[PDB]
Enzyme design. Structure first.
Site, PDB file in Angstrom:
ATOM      1  N   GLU A 140       0.831  -1.230   0.000  1.00  0.00           N
ATOM      2  CA  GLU A 140       0.000   0.000   0.000  1.00  0.00           C
ATOM      3  C   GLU A 140       0.868   1.285   0.000  1.00  0.00           C
ATOM      4  O   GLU A 140       0.599   2.224  -0.763  1.00  0.00           O
ATOM      5  CB  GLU A 140      -0.953   0.025   1.203  1.00  0.00           C
ATOM      6  CG  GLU A 140      -2.035  -1.129   1.295  1.00  0.00           C
ATOM      7  CD  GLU A 140      -3.145  -1.023   0.233  1.00  0.00           C
ATOM      8  OE1 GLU A 140      -3.451   0.097  -0.234  1.00  0.00           O
ATOM      9  OE2 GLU A 140      -3.714  -2.085  -0.098  1.00  0.00           O
ATOM     10  N   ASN A 152      -7.720   9.801  -5.866  1.00  0.00           N
ATOM     11  CA  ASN A 152      -8.649   8.928  -6.573  1.00  0.00           C
ATOM     12  C   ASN A 152      -9.538   9.720  -7.563  1.00  0.00           C
ATOM     13  O   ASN A 152      -9.684  10.914  -7.431  1.00  0.00           O
ATOM     14  CB  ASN A 152      -9.530   8.214  -5.523  1.00  0.00           C
ATOM     15  CG  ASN A 152      -8.708   7.348  -4.585  1.00  0.00           C
ATOM     16  OD1 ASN A 152      -7.834   6.586  -5.045  1.00  0.00           O
ATOM     17  ND2 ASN A 152      -8.976   7.448  -3.273  1.00  0.00           N
ATOM     18  N   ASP A 167     -12.837   9.904  -7.726  1.00  0.00           N
ATOM     19  CA  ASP A 167     -14.009  10.528  -7.105  1.00  0.00           C
ATOM     20  C   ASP A 167     -13.578  11.749  -6.253  1.00  0.00           C
ATOM     21  O   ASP A 167     -14.388  12.342  -5.552  1.00  0.00           O
ATOM     22  CB  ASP A 167     -14.806   9.510  -6.250  1.00  0.00           C
ATOM     23  CG  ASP A 167     -14.044   9.078  -5.020  1.00  0.00           C
ATOM     24  OD1 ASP A 167     -12.844   9.477  -4.857  1.00  0.00           O
ATOM     25  OD2 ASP A 167     -14.613   8.302  -4.231  1.00  0.00           O
ATOM     26  N   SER A 209     -11.626  11.756  -3.660  1.00  0.00           N
ATOM     27  CA  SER A 209     -11.095  11.361  -2.364  1.00  0.00           C
ATOM     28  C   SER A 209      -9.577  11.110  -2.510  1.00  0.00           C
ATOM     29  O   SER A 209      -9.033  11.105  -3.651  1.00  0.00           O
ATOM     30  CB  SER A 209     -11.810  10.133  -1.832  1.00  0.00           C
ATOM     31  OG  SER A 209     -11.609   9.013  -2.685  1.00  0.00           O
ATOM     32  N   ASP A 257      -6.244   8.658  -0.602  1.00  0.00           N
ATOM     33  CA  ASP A 257      -5.816   7.569   0.296  1.00  0.00           C
ATOM     34  C   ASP A 257      -4.578   8.058   1.058  1.00  0.00           C
ATOM     35  O   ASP A 257      -3.654   8.568   0.445  1.00  0.00           O
ATOM     36  CB  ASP A 257      -5.416   6.342  -0.513  1.00  0.00           C
ATOM     37  CG  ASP A 257      -6.589   5.638  -1.179  1.00  0.00           C
ATOM     38  OD1 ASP A 257      -7.747   6.098  -1.068  1.00  0.00           O
ATOM     39  OD2 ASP A 257      -6.324   4.601  -1.835  1.00  0.00           O
ATOM     40  N   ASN A 310      -8.768   5.946   3.233  1.00  0.00           N
ATOM     41  CA  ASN A 310      -9.393   6.922   2.349  1.00  0.00           C
ATOM     42  C   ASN A 310     -10.256   8.031   2.984  1.00  0.00           C
ATOM     43  O   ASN A 310     -10.860   7.850   4.056  1.00  0.00           O
ATOM     44  CB  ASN A 310     -10.079   6.222   1.168  1.00  0.00           C
ATOM     45  CG  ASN A 310     -11.433   5.667   1.530  1.00  0.00           C
ATOM     46  OD1 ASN A 310     -12.337   6.420   1.890  1.00  0.00           O
ATOM     47  ND2 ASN A 310     -11.580   4.346   1.446  1.00  0.00           N
ATOM     48  N   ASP A 348     -15.435  -3.564   9.583  1.00  0.00           N
ATOM     49  CA  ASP A 348     -16.647  -3.103   8.895  1.00  0.00           C
ATOM     50  C   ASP A 348     -17.415  -4.151   8.048  1.00  0.00           C
ATOM     51  O   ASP A 348     -18.449  -3.813   7.466  1.00  0.00           O
ATOM     52  CB  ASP A 348     -16.332  -1.841   8.084  1.00  0.00           C
ATOM     53  CG  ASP A 348     -17.580  -1.088   7.656  1.00  0.00           C
ATOM     54  OD1 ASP A 348     -18.295  -0.559   8.546  1.00  0.00           O
ATOM     55  OD2 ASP A 348     -17.818  -1.013   6.422  1.00  0.00           O
TER      56      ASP A 348
END
Lengths: 127, 245
Positions: free
Chosen positions: A35, A46, A48, A50, A52, A59, A101
């Site tokens: 990562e 990203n 959209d 957003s 990371d 994110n 989650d």
């Protein structure tokens, strides 16, 4: 800060990641490796809009607030800037929410690509 | 609330159609023909075809991230001559068709991160002379074709981390005079190979470009790119490989 492999394993173990949600220490080390290359300050934007953040690439859409991300939920209740620190506490605390989650570590795309289903314990050997 | 696109949201002023997170069974037919921004991220799209975006000739931004796409058709983006941003990240793409991006001469950002690409077609990026950002990280790339990046003279960001590269062809980055940032970590560079020498000298010569991410204000990590045997790549010189090469 760029962590060494064993240095990060030690830090993640101290912060309670070994076997968290069923995920051995090796999973978390490997995840950080692919990562962020163990780099606490790496970021990636990203499509959209957003971003990371940090050693585990958390994110700004769901998890942290960066003040520039549309439809953000800030589920970790934390500025994304806190996930860029040399101290991994905040990213670990937020990673614990992510892995809880429902989908386990599947959130981590480079983990899923390179670590998932491999001999991840190799990432903590020699330490 | 879109008058003409059921269950998506719109900003007719900004010519935006947002269907993100709506379960789609196909791309909706009522999209205004003057739409500029189309968000289809996380809609569950499983296929596209030559006719899917036909007529959407004003699109400048298309977001297909987080879908279930395994292949594309050679003509899927044909009509989209003004596209500036293409989001194809986090699909399941196994390959790209020959010529798939050839009509996108204005493309500025191309996100292909987080797919299953093993190879790139011959000349797939050649038409994209204005491209500033290319993300190919977190795929399964076994090699880069000779001259793949040669037409990309405006490129600033190239992400190649987390792939299956053992080397890059000689002079792979020669034409990238505007490059600021490259990611190279997470590959398996075979530092016994003579091809290494071009790469190690490049990194020594371009050490401020080699980074652990793509964002701004990140200090360089030229020693973070390592051979499959653990050695730092940039420490490998012609003399290191005097026996092999």
């Amino acid at each position: 800060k760029v962590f060494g492999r064993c240095e990060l394993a030690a830090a993640m173990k101290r912060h309670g990641l070994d076997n968290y949600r069923g995920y051995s220490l090796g999973n978390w080390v490997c995840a950080a490796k692919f990562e962020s290359n163990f780099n606490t300050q790496a970021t990636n934007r990203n499509t959209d809009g957003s971003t990371d953040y940090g050693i585990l690439q958390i994110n700004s859409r769901w998890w942290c607030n960066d003040g520039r991300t549309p439809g953000s939920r800030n589920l970790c209740n934390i500025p994304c800037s806190a996930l860029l620190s040399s101290d991994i506490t905040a990213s670990v605390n937020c990673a614990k929410k992510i892995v809880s989650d429902g989908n386990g570590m599947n959130a981590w795309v480079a983990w899923r690509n390179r670590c998932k289903g491999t001999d991840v314990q190799a990432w903590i050997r020699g330490c | 609330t879109c008058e003409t696109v059921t269950g998506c949201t719109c900003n007719e002023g900004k010519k935006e159609v947002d269907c993100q997170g709506k379960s789609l069974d196909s791309v909706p037919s009522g999209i205004p023909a003057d739409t500029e921004k189309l968000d289809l991220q996380s809609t569950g799209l499983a296929t596209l075809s030559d006719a899917t975006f036909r007529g959407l000739t004003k699109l400048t931004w298309l977001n297909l991230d987080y879908n279930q796409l395994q292949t594309l058709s050679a003509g899927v983006f044909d009509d989209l001559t003004e596209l500036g941003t293409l989001g194809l990240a986090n699909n399941q793409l196994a390959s790209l068709p020959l010529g798939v991006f050839d009509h996108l001469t204005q493309l500025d950002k191309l996100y292909l991160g987080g797919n299953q690409l093993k190879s790139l077609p011959s000349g797939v990026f050649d038409r994209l002379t204005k491209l500033k950002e290319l993300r190919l990280n977190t795929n399964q790339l076994q090699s880069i074709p000779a001259g793949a990046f040669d037409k990309l003279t405006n490129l600033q960001t190239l992400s190649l981390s987390t792939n299956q590269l053992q080397s890059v062809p000689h002079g792979a980055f020669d034409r990238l005079g505007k490059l600021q940032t490259i990611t190279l970590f997470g590959n398996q560079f075979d530092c016994s190979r003579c091809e290494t020498l071009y790469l190690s000298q490049w990194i020594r010569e371009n050490s401020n470009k080699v980074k652990d991410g793509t964002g701004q204000n990140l200090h360089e990590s030229p020693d973070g790119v390592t051979c499959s045997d653990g050695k730092v790549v940039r420490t490998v010189t012609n003399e290191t490989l005097k026996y092999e090469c």
